Design a protein around this ligand. Sequence first.
Ligand code: PIO
Ligand code: PIO
Ligand code: 9Z9
Ligand code: NA
Lengths: 149, 511
Amino acid sequence: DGRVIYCVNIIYWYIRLLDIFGVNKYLGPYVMMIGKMMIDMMYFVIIMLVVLMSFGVARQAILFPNEEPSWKLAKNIFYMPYWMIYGEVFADQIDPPCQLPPCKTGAWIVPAIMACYLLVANILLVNLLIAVFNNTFFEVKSISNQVWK
Amino acid sequence: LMGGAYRCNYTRKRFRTLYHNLNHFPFPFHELMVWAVLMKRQKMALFFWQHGEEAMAKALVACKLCKAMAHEASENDMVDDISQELNHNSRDFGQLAVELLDQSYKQDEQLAMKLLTYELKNWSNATCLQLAVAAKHRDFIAHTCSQMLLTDMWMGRLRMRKNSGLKVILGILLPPSILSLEFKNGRKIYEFYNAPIVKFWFYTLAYIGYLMLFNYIVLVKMERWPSTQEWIVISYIFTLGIEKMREILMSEPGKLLQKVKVWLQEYWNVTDLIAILLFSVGMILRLQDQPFRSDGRVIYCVNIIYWYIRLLDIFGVNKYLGPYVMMIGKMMIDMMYFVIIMLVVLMSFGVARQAILFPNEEPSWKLAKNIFYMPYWMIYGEVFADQIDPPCQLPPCKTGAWIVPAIMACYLLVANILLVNLLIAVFNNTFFEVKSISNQVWKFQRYQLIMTFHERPVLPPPLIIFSHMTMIFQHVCRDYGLKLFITDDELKKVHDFEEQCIEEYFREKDD
Ligand SMILES: CCCCCCCC(=O)OC[C@H](COP(=O)(O)O[C@@H]1[C@H](O)[C@H](O)[C@@H](OP(=O)(O)O)[C@H](OP(=O)(O)O)[C@H]1O)OC(=O)CCCCCCC
Ligand SMILES: CCCCCCCC(=O)OC[C@H](COP(=O)(O)O[C@@H]1[C@H](O)[C@H](O)[C@@H](OP(=O)(O)O)[C@H](OP(=O)(O)O)[C@H]1O)OC(=O)CCCCCCC
Ligand SMILES: COCC(CCO[C@H]1CC[C@@]2(C)C(=CC[C@H]3[C@@H]4C[C@@H]5O[C@]6(CC[C@@H](C)CO6)[C@@H](C)[C@@H]5[C@@]4(C)CC[C@@H]32)C1)COC
Ligand code: NA
């Protein structure tokens, strides 16, 4: 357990190098820009979290209808729908090819919900976030320069 | 022309009895300005506007009348210059009203707030805010003074303004903590539990609890008879349905087919009705044998999708999330325009690949699946080298199998480098106007939020059945927030302040 605490504590001392980088004339302003875009990214990540939870609950309820109540249920809701939007989309881990295994009732809805979810989470929200970063950048740049100086 | 709830002074029985056997007018300039604005004489109306009293009410009524007359002229296929003239008049009167409000707020804030909410006895008892809302004057409601008034109305009779929310949550979760809260100058509980913000937080906590219960009965196994949580969810939806029915039957018009068509104007109500009906169908199909039980489970899952999505309506109360929701609403239209082109290209590539690779397929419904499945999952990072263009001991090679990777290269280049980047450009270069319009619309709809929360009963929908049965008892038998009745001395002071304000405005503009 102490080794684990060490391995988690090393991350902060790695991140603290940005405070050392702040002495530069071109890196400090970018660090402060990151600081403000973190707030913007949180505000635009709450909505994505809502949509992700919805799709995960739908898939987990449709595919597995005979699950005993266990803490592992809270893992399948967040695991796969979060790894899915980062390029790890699979065709067998979701909507399995139901000699052949029996077919769960309503298994044909999961790919359609997945298509809608991918369209609304990889084409709409991230592009809107890019627009928000782009159209609120000059003021942040000027304020960051003033604050660093 | 004015609207539904309006009742002009001429049609009242007092004036009808006066006119049956035949005096003067108390305020003549009201009648003269109504005449000048009905006969499409603009300069005379502007001259009559600055005389008399209740100038802001006259400006708002003129704006609404001009807009309604423009709509009527456009509907009756007139010369189509009359519509432009009437719209110009409406915009001029709206601008005058906004300027007068700005001057009044910049002179004295308290009298400016008192001016916007006193009952107007000459205009069928409507405050200035209601007249502005009926005219859809977005700039008037979105002003600083109106927003401050709406905030003071929404906060209720409390006095917490440095940091709210957490205090209200702690009060509603710990009832012995309510008393240690300052108020505005036994009876300190009825005032706390009737502030609109407290009703909103009660409703939000009830909704979160309902969603927590809904996410438990679909993940775990289901049984022949519903468990306790399923009964709680069903009771919640039933009470929500009867609350919607009560809301419909307590509308403004008097016709059943007219109240319904004005209640079906916000898409949230329509979607709520659809979801309630679908859940009712699912629950009816649920209390059956195994296949219908499975179908009811599926309907429960889809309804859970909808109720999860409906949390953005709760999120809209924030000062920074509502505008982003509306921006999403408009970028959805833009994305819908581009998805048609993307789908055309996708269908083309899918048909070409499916026809090239498999030349001995019997006609089956599975053909419509291979066209859309793989070419759609391909542009989301799942590009494979063996699932498409297989390595044809070695299997035989289909004729023309070497075209599929080339068509795929062209399709990926045109669907991941061109169309999505053009969509990013479209989002980026049409963002400032959408942002400004979204801010204006949210600041305008804060009033509707405040009113619809002031109208609602105290109890949340899970236990609203007690407040509905008290409606029956009180049937067989607006002090503030909507209007503010005042005496004659206060009325005279308000009139004098308004005259001083309008005179100063005209003098400053001329200077
Ligand atoms: C992992 C790294 C962790 C430590 C990173 C530590 C963080 C870090 O990167 O510090 C950079 C440090 C700062 O030095 P500093 O900014 O004070 O020096 C400026 C720099 O020399 C500019 O080139 C000068 O002209 P200009 O501005 O171009 O016009 C400028 O003159 P002026 O314009 O003001 O008149 C100088 O002031 O030195 C370096 O720049 C590179 C040599 C580093 C060599 C050492 C590399 C290790
Ligand atoms: C899953 C979540 C579903 C429910 C989400 C429910 C949706 C939701 O998020 O509501 C937020 C709610 C709204 O409160 P509200 O906006 O009315 O309160 C404003 C807020 O306190 C600002 O910080 C104030 O200053 P500023 O604007 O910064 O200058 C502002 O004063 P002013 O500027 O007007 O004079 C206040 O009006 O409270 C919170 O803000 C966070 C505490 C929430 C604590 C409770 C968290 C549960
Ligand atoms: C390993 O075996 C575990 C066993 C104890 C099992 O108890 C069960 C009690 C219900 C509980 C805690 C369990 C699994 C799903 C859990 C759901 C996940 C949901 O997530 C949330 C996620 C986020 C919310 C927005 C929606 O709901 C919950 C309302 C929901 C939630 C926490 C309700 C609670 C459920 C475990 C050990 O005992 C010996
Ligand atoms: Na990718």
